[PDB]
Amino acid sequence: TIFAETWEASEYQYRNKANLKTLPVNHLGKLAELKFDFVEYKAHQLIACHLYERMTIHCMNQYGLFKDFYRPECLDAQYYFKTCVELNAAYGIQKKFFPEHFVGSPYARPVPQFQQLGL
Amino acid sequence: KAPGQIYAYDIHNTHYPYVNIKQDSQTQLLASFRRSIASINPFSYRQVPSQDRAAFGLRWGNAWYAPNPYPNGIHFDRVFPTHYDPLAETNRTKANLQLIKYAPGNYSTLVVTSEKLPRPCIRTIQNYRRCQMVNGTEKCNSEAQDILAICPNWALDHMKEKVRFYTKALAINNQTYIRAMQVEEYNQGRTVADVAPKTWIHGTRQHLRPDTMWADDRYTNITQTEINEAIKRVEARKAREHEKKPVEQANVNANTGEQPVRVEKSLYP
Amino acid sequence: MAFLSGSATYDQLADYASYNHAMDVNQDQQAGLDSWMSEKDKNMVKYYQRSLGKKVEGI
Amino acid sequence: MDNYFTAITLLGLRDQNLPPFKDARLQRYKSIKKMIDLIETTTKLAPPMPVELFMLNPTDPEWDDDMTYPTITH
Amino acid sequence: KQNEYLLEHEDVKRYVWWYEDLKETLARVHRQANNHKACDFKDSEIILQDFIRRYTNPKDNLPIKFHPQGQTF
Amino acid sequence: PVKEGQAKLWFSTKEEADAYDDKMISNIELKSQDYEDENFSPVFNRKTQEYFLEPSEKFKS
Amino acid sequence: MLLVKAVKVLVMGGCMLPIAFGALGTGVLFAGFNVALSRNPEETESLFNNTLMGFALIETFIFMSIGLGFFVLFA
Amino acid sequence: MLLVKAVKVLVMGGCMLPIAFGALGTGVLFAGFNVALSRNPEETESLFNNTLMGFALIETFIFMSIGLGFFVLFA
């Protein structure tokens, strides 16, 4: 689990595998595409995947779930939120049981003890 | 022998909900007209699938709809470095051959999977366990050699590595157990008897006030006079707490030609 | 007149309006989100000035 | 960022709002670090139940037929 | 009809009782303060520790023991 | 003066509570919309009630 | 930030200036067209076409202005 | 940055000033073309070409401003 608002991108990139995905920060630009009026505090937009969650709520309050929620600004928020928590759940597990896969980990390329050098 | 209908058919009660995501007047008016005549219209297409008939997805005008792919900074340049930022645009611009290639899996997630070992290798494992629980381990040598011989070597390597992984996960789970079951200084000597008869709701906003001034009407009747007096009292307490301050430590990252420590960043620049 | 007749009054106010975070906090206060501030939060602008290269003491 | 809904719930974002200043807002993130180690440990104490309950064993010789799906080429 | 009997095994009951104990346990968990410290869940740690101490033995080399039909994720 | 409500604090003693109220009250910055006030702010008038995101009835229905 | 939005809407108002000069320019254009017609009424149709054509060029600035306005108002 | 950006976008609004004067210069130009056409229609095509030609010199300043506008808006 991430216990902060900011994380180093390199810490979630692989060292011995091709990097085909990143763990990007929240897309604050999607928040300006909501046409209706809403109240959002800047203190909640950086934490991972929560912005897309609040946006989905704002859109599900203004509109419902039938024939009015089906607009591009609201479906992309629901899709982002659902996708953000799935990717973060997998990255979090991979960080817990496979920390050696990521850059910055001292086990990705272990540095040997001085007793192994024969000096 | 009626065809089977999915749960979504009972939400809409029709196979022809003309759902178009494009929010232009020309599109939504035509859909409402088309949504009404779908019963007697030959140019009608389904969007709710069934056992007897497949269906189409969400419509985008005359084309089809798909959400914007989740932002992914991975890209591949062809002519010049574009410095693609997936957060700089709302909708992802198309990939031009001479400009950029995006990462694979526009709509993809990260999962963990496993290969299925060969069937004959599985049967040798079933026979070993069966002979194990029946006759015991010491009388399963023939069944053990059949595994090492029939199972291809790539499978024996997987079996060898599965044990090392679960051994790793076993330790990672027990270390969390140790940190979790550790008794902190603020809970020394406390047991279930010292616990309060409270539930989750008792820590919410209705019962437990948040640490903000405008969460409720607590400080709504405060005047500037009461403030000036409070500023004097807090400064009085600071006459006894400001006496102490941590000493400045040495900068471990003083040398720029040295791998710096990923030390916690300051709150402010 | 005291604000115009000063030298640093223009800076203390400009460096504060230029710090995007401090203005984000103010935007939250205007909406109803406010609380108490620590000694480290009070100097959020001094940290911003130092980063630019200004010589500020009393952090 | 695993245990998303658990962490968001512990921070109180389901009923209140975080402090607008980074000092306390960050301390509140580090405050649940103990609880996550606990709730994760509890979720790993579930007892076993027969696998042959809602799922037939795919390794059974009955399924060695490797049968195909017969279709109609309309 | 051949495998209906497996639902009569006591392990199905043991599984449901563990799920309810976790429900009642997490329902009792509560925030005790808003000082932004780990002590805000001071009493909840004791509640969860009692749950863990109820299905494990902390005074062992490996309180969490591995078995192929167990939990890893 | 401080007003009481259903939402209570988390302090055992009364001195720690009073110390918390004095800390919050010392940080209040009043912004009035009426002229002739020592704390007057035509623009940038702070609201005195915090907004909370909740699922509406259209949401739950 | 907030002020940047305020100046944006302020600029959007500035677009009403060509709307003002376009009105005066149009009146002047038709003012000359009237006197021009009286001088040589034999070619009323030619003068008339040139009158509207010039006016079309005026509305170009207009659409150009509001376009810039709505752009700066949203970009 | 944000403070200077606010005046940047405001300056971009200033570019709508030539858009106004260009309209007035147009209304005046075609007026002279019309009245001048009546006095000597024998050279209509000549006057007509010079009319649009002159107009090209008007949108010159227009595009120049917008160019200079977006430039300082980002430079």
Ligand SMILES: CCCCCCCCCCCCCCCCCC(=O)OC[C@H](COP(=O)([O-])OCC(O)COP(=O)([O-])OC[C@@H](COC(=O)CCCCCCCCCCCCCCCCC)OC(=O)CCCCCCCCCCCCCCCCC)OC(=O)CCCCCCCCCCCCCCCCC
């Ligand atoms: C190219 C040539 C042509 C171009 C010409 C024009 C150029 C125009 C562009 C502007 C140029 C730069 C000047 C911008 C000034 C900022 C104004 C502003 O944002 O309002 C906030 C400003 C302050 O808000 P507040 O309510 O007092 O905040 C109280 C809170 O408690 C505060 O507490 P808080 O905790 O909430 O903090 C909030 C935070 C918020 O932070 C921010 O948002 C940043 C704000 C941006 C500015 C910050 C940097 C300022 C640095 C100081 C240097 C200023 C130099 C000015 C140079 C002028 C150039 C000649 O900090 C602030 O409060 C910032 C304070 C802003 C003070 C601004 C400086 C005062 C100027 C003093 C001279 C006054 C002359 C008035 C003459 C009027 C003539 C009509 O509001 C006012 O000043 C009200 C107006 C003045 C009162 C009298 C009523 C006048 C009504 C006039 C109506 C006509 C309007 C104009 C018509 C024009 C067409 C005819």
